[PDB]
């Protein structure tokens, strides 16, 4: 049975944005409940393109899925942040939620071609799709008002503001709060920029202004934490509404009556609920078990406050919507990539509905085992241990750590950068680390910004993270599973920070890979520009200290270059590389084994399939080289190993 290689992993299809959870709106049920519509994305590293398909599948399971549209460009998820109308893209794709017409015969949805987001309309038995709305601005959302009428939104003001920036540039721009140098040398558009609503009649091609009523049908979103059954409104609240770390509890109000709080433990920290008038019940989801490692679904007769658990598992259920007494969900788990599933709301039985991948038991899969421990600060931790398919007990393996969430399918860790199953296939033990809760998250805080400030104070939470990794390593060391002198560490985003912290404040790692650098004043103050730099200070990032200040000594590679002896590979997007340069240069000057790779037209999370594959392969090669002393003799890698042999020789 063939192995799971980087070539296999990069081609495993997906549904919705990279990191999806309970409320990710990645599917839509038809009005009568008989069909589910959703987008499938599949990456091709040879053509270096994602291929997108809009898919319709009967919820009864009896007929094959149908592609009702094929095509489009990778549409970035973007939002306003920091007072900018559009922050740099994280690189993640926007989840595309198809809108069914009231008749159930057509879909409307966003789709990008030639750099422009339009509304497309597709026939649901497969007969074709075409764009029906385009404007000077990207369309941001759409709904059906009736079978022939669409309302849609976007920001022509954003376009106009861009043209004003372009005019102003003729006189030079003052460097101020509009700039974010890391990502580009132009002023950004500042908020406020308004959203404009328009209505299109598809039968006449005419457009008109929306009415306030129509507008609210687009603007208002359902609260997934609120439901009605009869006269009873279910919601969730805290005994102390200000304290964000106080657990929420299910509450019931009959009409305008007093709220009644459910006392049961099961009613705490609900993530999703659904009311069913016919059955007169409330259903809800939540996380539970050690370190919240499992999901569970509850059924609660709406007369009372006695929830009963009907399903629980490791994994995730995402985007779930109800048809009668089934839930239709996306679902994933360690060895199951994202697929659609039906959950029986009486028995709690889960059945396959649609899997865009073949069955992976076709491949020789690594062995997975969920680890649990309480860390030295008393906090419950889980993580996943992945072992090579031919693992014989007694064998001490090199270890590679991938961060920092492990709830779902073991793909590439956060940002999909570090290939878990292929690493195991290559002979490594892999720890898929699920970063634990901070101490601060157990204390009273009125703002997530104030909590952050407590976590960064003296890098207290970063130490809790590092000590947790050291606990896990020590565990696997006692079990005789790993050689503790041969531990590799990877990170992207918050995991990158952990890598930087880890290489300076321990000697437990023999090799590392990061997607970005650095955690230093240059990156956080200078390259962010004055707006973001100033805003980060409230989060506990000391951007008013220069790099030789006390806060940065724990993480700056410029300050600590001369004692940083661990081999480090940085595989950066061009959009983040500038931040790495002072650090990189100090390391080279101090003759350390560091290498920086740059990828063009990329983001914080990488989107181009050829790039991802190349990242996967180099990261495997890197760990094989430093932790196994092995090199692949393929002649197109010879120059890479020349370079890495030279890095190795610097160490003496």
């Amino acid at each position: 049975a063939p192995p799971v290689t980087p070539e296999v992993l990069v081609r495993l299809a997906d549904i919705g944005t990279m990191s999806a959870s309970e409320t990710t709106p990645l599917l839509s049920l038809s009005p009568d409940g008989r069909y589910v519509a959703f987008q499938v994305r599949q990456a091709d590293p040879v053509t270096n393109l994602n291929v997108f398909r809009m898919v319709v599948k009967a919820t009864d399971g009896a007929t094959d899925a149908i592609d009702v549209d094929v095509g489009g460009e990778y549409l970035f998820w973007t939002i306003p942040s920091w007072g900018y109308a559009r922050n740099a893209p994280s690189g993640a794709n926007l989840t595309i939620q198809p809108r069914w017409s009231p008749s159930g015969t057509h879909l409307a949805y966003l789709r990008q071609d030639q750099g422009r987001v339009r509304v497309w309309r597709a026939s649901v038995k497969g007969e074709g799709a075409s764009p029906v709305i385009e404007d000077a601005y990207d369309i941001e959302d759409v709904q059906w008002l009736d079978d022939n009428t669409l309302i849609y939104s976007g920001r022509p003001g954003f376009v106009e503001a861009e043209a004003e920036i372009e005019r102003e540039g003729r006189r030079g721009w003052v460097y101020d709060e509009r700039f974010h140098p890391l990502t580009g040398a132009r002023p950004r558009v500042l908020e406020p920029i308004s959203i404009v609503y328009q209505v299109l009649d598809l039968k006449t091609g005419t457009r008109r202004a929306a009415t306030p009523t129509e507008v609210a049908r687009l603007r208002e979103k359902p609260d997934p934490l609120r439901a009605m059954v009869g006269r009873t409104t279910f919601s969730v609240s805290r005994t102390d509404p200000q304290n964000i770390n106080a657990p929420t509890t299910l509450v019931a109000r009959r009409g305008e009556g007093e709220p009644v709080r459910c006392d049961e433990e099961a009613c705490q920290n609900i993530t999703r609920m659904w009311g069913d008038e016919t059955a007169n019940v409330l259903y809800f989801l939540r996380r539970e078990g050690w370190a919240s490692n499992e999901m569970a679904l509850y059924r609660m007769p709406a007369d009372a406050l006695k929830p009963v658990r009907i399903w629980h598992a490791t994994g995730l259920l995402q985007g779930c919507e109800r048809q009668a007494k089934r839930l239709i969900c996306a679902q994933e788990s360690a060895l199951q990539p994202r697929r659609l599933v039906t959950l029986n709301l009486t028995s709690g039985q889960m059945s396959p509905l649609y899997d865009p991948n073949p069955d992976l038991s076709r491949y020789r899969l690594p062995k997975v085992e969920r680890l649990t421990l309480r860390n030295r600060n008393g906090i419950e931790v889980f993580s996943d241990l992945v072992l090579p398919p031919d693992y014989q007990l007694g064998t001490r393996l090199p270890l590679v750590i991938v961060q920092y969430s492990s709830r779902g399918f073991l793909r590439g860790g956060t940002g999909d950068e570090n290939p878990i199953l292929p690493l195991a296939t290559a002979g490594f033990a892999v720890l898929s680390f699920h970063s634990p809760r901070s101490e601060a998250s157990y204390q009273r805080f009125t703002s997530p910004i104030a909590q952050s400030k407590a976590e960064y104070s003296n890098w207290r939470n970063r130490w809790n993270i590092l000590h947790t990794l050291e606990d896990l390593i020590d565990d696997l060391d006692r079990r005789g599973v790993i050689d503790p002198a041969r531990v590799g560490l990877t990170g992207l985003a918050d995991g990158a920070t952990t890598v930087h912290f880890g290489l300076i404040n321990s000697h437990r790692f023999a090799a590392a890979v990061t997607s970005s650098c650095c955690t230093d004043s240059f990156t956080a103050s200078v390259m962010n520009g004055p707006r973001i730099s100033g805003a980060l200070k409230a989060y506990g990032i000391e951007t008013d200290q220069a790099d030789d200040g006390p806060f940065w000594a724990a993480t700056s590679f410029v300050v600590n270059a001369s004692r940083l002896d661990t081999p480090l590979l940085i595989q950066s997007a061009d959009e983040e590389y500038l931040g790495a340069l002072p650090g990189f240069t100090a390391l080279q000057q101090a003759r350390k084994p560091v290498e920086l790779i740059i990828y063009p037209n990329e983001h914080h999370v990488k989107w181009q399939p050829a790039h991802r594959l190349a990242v996967y392969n180099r990261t495997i090669d890197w760990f094989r080289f430093w932790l196994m002393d092995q090199s692949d003799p393929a002649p197109d890698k010879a120059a890479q190993y020349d370079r890495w042999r030279a890095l190795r020789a610097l160490r003496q």
Binding site: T17, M18, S19, S21, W77, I79, S81, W82, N87, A88, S90, G91, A92, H180, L182, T414, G415, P448, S452, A493, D494, A496, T497, S516, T519, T523, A524, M527, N528, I532, L536, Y539, I541, E576, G579, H604, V605
Partner: peptide
């Protein structure tokens, strides 16, 4: 991180959760 909600994804202006 990929998902732009609550907390810091590193120190360069991206959000987590």
């Amino acid at each position: 991180g990929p998902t732009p909600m609550v907390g810091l994804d590193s120190v360069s202006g991206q959000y987590w959760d």
